[PDB]
């Protein structure tokens with residue numbers, strides 16, 4: 808079966824771990840030690856295809872990543888501001904401009920929003936990447952974010 812190595816990056820507190828655990832374990836974590844960096848697997852079906860996802864939740868495996876989720880939180884302007892740092896890291900570690908990537912705006916369940924959809928869509932367009940709005944709490948968008956990334960890897964191959 809086809810394996811996809813995915814890496815989740817972004818500022819502390821955006822929901823990288825919550826997004827990962829919701830995908831893998833089907834539950835929402837209200838707190839998750841921010842120093843734990845681990846890799847997590849789930850065999851899933853994406854568009855009818857069975858595949859293995861190896862997901863590195865960051866906090867010697869970044870460089871082997873085939874696609875990256877760049878996460879910010881929609882009530883965390885600072886995390887949005889930091890996205891360019893993580894995009895550039897990824898370019899450098901892959902030595903490429905064309906790396907499969909998805910911009911994820913998480914915590915969409917929260918009303919105290921400060922990054923609007925247009926802002927984020929504009930950033931995504933400046934990188935040529937999809938933008939997906941998620942909630943790790945509700946599950947909105949979660950599969951779509953990871954599965955879109957897999958679809959970007961599929962195209963890239």
Ligand SMILES: Nc1nc2c(ncn2[C@@H]2O[C@H](COP(=O)(O)OP(=O)(O)O)[C@@H](O)[C@H]2O)c(=O)[nH]1
Nearest residue numbers: 819820821822823824825836837914942943944
């Ligand atoms: N309301 C809400 N809280 C979230 C969401 N995702 C994460 N959180 C919370 O935000 C905090 C940080 O999440 P965490 O996954 O540890 O962020 P990380 O540092 O990026 O791994 C925790 O208290 C999570 O419960 C979400 O979509 N909605």
Ligand SMILES: [Mg+2]
Nearest residue numbers: 823824841866
């Ligand atoms: Mg974490």
Ligand code: NA
Nearest residue numbers: 884921922923
């Ligand atoms: Na503003």
